[PDB]
Amino acid sequence: MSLDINQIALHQLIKRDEQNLELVLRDSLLEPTETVVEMVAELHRVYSAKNKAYGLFSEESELAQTLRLQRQGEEDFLAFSRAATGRLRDELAKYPFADGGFVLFCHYRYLAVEYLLVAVLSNLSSMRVNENLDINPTHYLDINHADIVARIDLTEWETNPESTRYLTFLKGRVGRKVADFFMDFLGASEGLNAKAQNRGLLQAVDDFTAEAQLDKAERQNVRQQVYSYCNEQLQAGEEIELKSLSKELAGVSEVSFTEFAAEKGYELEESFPADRSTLRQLTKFAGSGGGLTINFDAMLLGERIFWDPATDTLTIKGTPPNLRDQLQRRTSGGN
Amino acid sequence: MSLDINQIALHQLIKRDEQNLELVLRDSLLEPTETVVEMVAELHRVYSAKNKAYGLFSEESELAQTLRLQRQGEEDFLAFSRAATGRLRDELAKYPFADGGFVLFCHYRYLAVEYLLVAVLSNLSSMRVNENLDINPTHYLDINHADIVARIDLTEWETNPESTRYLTFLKGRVGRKVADFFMDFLGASEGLNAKAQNRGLLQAVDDFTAEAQLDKAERQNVRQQVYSYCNEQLQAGEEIELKSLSKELAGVSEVSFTEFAAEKGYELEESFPADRSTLRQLTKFAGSGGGLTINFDAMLLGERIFWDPATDTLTIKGTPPNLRDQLQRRTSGGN
Numbered sequence: 001m002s003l004d005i006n007q008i009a010l011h012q013l014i015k016r017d018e019q020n021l022e023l024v025l026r027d028s029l030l031e032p033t034e035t036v037v038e039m040v041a042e043l044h045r046v047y048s049a050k051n052k053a054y055g056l057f058s059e060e061s062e063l064a065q066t067l068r069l070q071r072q073g074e075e076d077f078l079a080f081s082r083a084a085t086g087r088l089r090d091e092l093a094k095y096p097f098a099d100g101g102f103v104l105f106c107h108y109r110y111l112a113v114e115y116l117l118v119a120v121l122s123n124l125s126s127m128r129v130n131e132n133l134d135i136n137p138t139h140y141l142d143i144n145h146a147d148i149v150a151r152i153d154l155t156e157w158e159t160n161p162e163s164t165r166y167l168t169f170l171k172g173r174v175g176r177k178v179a180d181f182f183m184d185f186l187g188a189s190e191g192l193n194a195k196a197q198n199r200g201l202l203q204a205v206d207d208f209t210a211e212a213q214l215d216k217a218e219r220q221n222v223r224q225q226v227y228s229y230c231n232e233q234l235q236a237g238e239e240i241e242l243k244s245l246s247k248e249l250a251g252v253s254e255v256s257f258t259e260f261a262a263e264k265g266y267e268l269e270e271s272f273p274a275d276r277s278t279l280r281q282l283t284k285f286a287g288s289g290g291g292l293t294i295n296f297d298a299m300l301l302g303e304r305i306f307w308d309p310a311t312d313t314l315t316i317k318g319t320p321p322n323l324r325d326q327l328q329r330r331t332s333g334g335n
Numbered sequence: 336m337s338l339d340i341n342q343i344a345l346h347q348l349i350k351r352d353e354q355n356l357e358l359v360l361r362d363s364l365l366e367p368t369e370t371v372v373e374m375v376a377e378l379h380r381v382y383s384a385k386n387k388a389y390g391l392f393s394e395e396s397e398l399a400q401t402l403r404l405q406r407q408g409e410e411d412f413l414a415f416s417r418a419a420t421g422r423l424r425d426e427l428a429k430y431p432f433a434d435g436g437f438v439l440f441c442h443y444r445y446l447a448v449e450y451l452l453v454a455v456l457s458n459l460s461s462m463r464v465n466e467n468l469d470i471n472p473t474h475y476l477d478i479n480h481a482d483i484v485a486r487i488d489l490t491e492w493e494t495n496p497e498s499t500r501y502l503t504f505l506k507g508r509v510g511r512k513v514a515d516f517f518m519d520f521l522g523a524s525e526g527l528n529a530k531a532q533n534r535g536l537l538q539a540v541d542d543f544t545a546e547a548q549l550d551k552a553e554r555q556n557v558r559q560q561v562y563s564y565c566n567e568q569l570q571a572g573e574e575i576e577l578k579s580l581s582k583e584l585a586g587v588s589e590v591s592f593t594e595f596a597a598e599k600g601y602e603l604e605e606s607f608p609a610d611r612s613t614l615r616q617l618t619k620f621a622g623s624g625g626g627l628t629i630n631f632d633a634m635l636l637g638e639r640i641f642w643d644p645a646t647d648t649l650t651i652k653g654t655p656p657n658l659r660d661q662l663q664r665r666t667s668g669g670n
Contacts, residue, residue: 030468035462036470126476127476127478128463129474129476135370136370138463138475140462141462206668287661289655289656289657290631290635290655291619292629292639293631294629294658296625300625304627307666311652312652312654313650314650316650317648318624319642319649320627320628323620323624327644
């Protein structure tokens with residue numbers, strides 16, 4: 001592969017009753033064996049797809065200053081994978097309904113960035129099969145659905161102090177509670193919010209096609225251009241470059257767009273991920289109220305689907321033949 | 336548990352190059368060990384949730400008359416799990432992109448019905464963990480996502496000859512092609528189609544609130560009653576009883592509903608599963624055309640959302656405040 005595994009450790013937590021998360025601290029840093037390789041390799045791909053969160057530590061970061069010295073060569077990785085793993089239980093044993101499981105610590109470098117991966121794998125169990133009709137019970141690891149995971153961006157943390165990203169972790173799908181499990185586990189503030197920046201993207205694009213003072217054709221295409229760019233980054237694992245966005249967008253206003261947000265001082269950084277829910281509103285709509293839900297392409301403005309705002313009345317011409325077949329059933333055969 | 340495992344067999348198919356699905360026929364019927372128990376037990380739960388298909392064999396059923404004699408005590412289960420498993424490869428080795436995997440044969444009885452389960456488990460692989468930081472590679476089974484599976488209803492097949500259900504298997508989610516993999520594997524006709532019966536349910540309910548000659552209040556509640564019944568069966572693993580449907584529905588027309596479909600001779604059997612896509616049209620709608628998609632509760636008929644059929648024009652009053660917040664952005668800040 002194209003990744004190198006600096007150091008690797010493995011510790012286990014098990015529950016005896018409910019709050020008895022006995023620790024199983026490893027007599028040695030697990031060696032960087034070959035079997036570890038494709039495991040941690042699969043971890044980094046999967047995280048690098050999943051949505052994340054962002055922030056920076058605190059002056060009181062009770063785990064930062066334990067690492068701020070480990071990175072100096074004072075605490076061993078084992079000595080640090082020990083103190084990290086113990087203070088883990090003390091932050092999970094306040095959740096009684098907590099299964100047992102392992103606590104991975106892969107230190108690794110990958111393409112100019114050195115990362116430190118922290119993975120608590122739910123431990124599943126199923127029926128191993130050896131050679132000859134000797135179906136056994138075995139354990140494996142939750143490697144496709146492990147949602148309790150984080151990774152620090154070491155190299156941009158030791159170089160940029162004021163960066164607000166070097167600290168990332170997964171948010172819970174339903175609840176924003178696994179986020180709070182990690183933030184108290186590290187002592188990190190909410191900084192860079194992904195929705196905060198996409199939401200903050202369009203409120204400057206409307207202020208841009210409104211200085212330009214354009215029309216539906218020119219203004220929507222700007223919004224459509226913004227989408228064509230963003231979505232092709234979304235299906236590529238690549239972020240939204242503020243600069244790249246400006247070139248395909250420069251020569252709208254004579255002045256560039258990044259200058260137009262920096263002299264207006266709009267607090268959008270150089271890069272940020274592309275929130276798909278926020279970014280459809282450029283070209284696709286939706287709504288939710290009274291069981292009724294719609295969605296449609298915004299070039300229907302003025303052409304099929306009409307709205308009179310005073311009366312908040314929505315007018316539609318030419319129903320989908322799919323639904324059009326449905327309504328023939330309630331009224332035609334209906335008196 | 337509440338299930339008994341009559342006989343159990345296990346055979347493996349492996350590919351060497353592409354069409355070299357070498358067979359690995361078992362020197363013995365795998366015994367009904369304890370480790371088999373919870374495996375096959377999980378298989379039956381999962382199938383009994385998943386959607387299925389239905390049909391009956393053929394006079395030329397090239398596997399039926401091999402079992403029509405096995406059930407008489409002539410061919411051993413091993414002798415039959417042998418001839419079944421070999422003629423399996425000859426029906427899959429026409430798909431080159433075919434992984435290796437195992438071929439399960441659990442004969443079992445369960446609550447008055449004797450079943451014969453046939454399960455080809457995709458074989459996955461991952462990292463077993465033994466005691467002490469000795470991460471190994473192991474194999475397990477695709478037990479949560481195995482979609483190549485079927486089970487014959489033995490007891491209603493040896494008792495009802497004209498039944499069209501005793502032969503069930505999973506349909507592919509995207510393609511109706513795994514259905515064709517199984518039908519040629521058995522020699523079974525398409526008989527009882529699940530969509531065919533739900534679709535066939537409403538065309539008799541409209542003919543029922545139109546003999547009754549009722550209005551929106553009474554006719555919709557009939558349709559709503561039908562939904563309240565069907566969906567509570569859908570989240571219970573239970574089928575649509577034609578009779579039970581008629582009681583909660585009798586005293587609409589003086590005559591019952593099952594008689595109203597039997598003297599009209601409508602070819603709906605006693606039971607059938609509840610197709611959710613077909614059964615929302617009672618009370619919930621949708622449509623698809625030109626990127627536009629809607630959906631809503633049908634009690635908006637005449638109250639919020641209006642349609643003039645001549646002009647195929649759809650009129651809506653009071654947009655969802657969710658969307659209502661979206662449209663304030665394209666027009667208000669918009670000139």
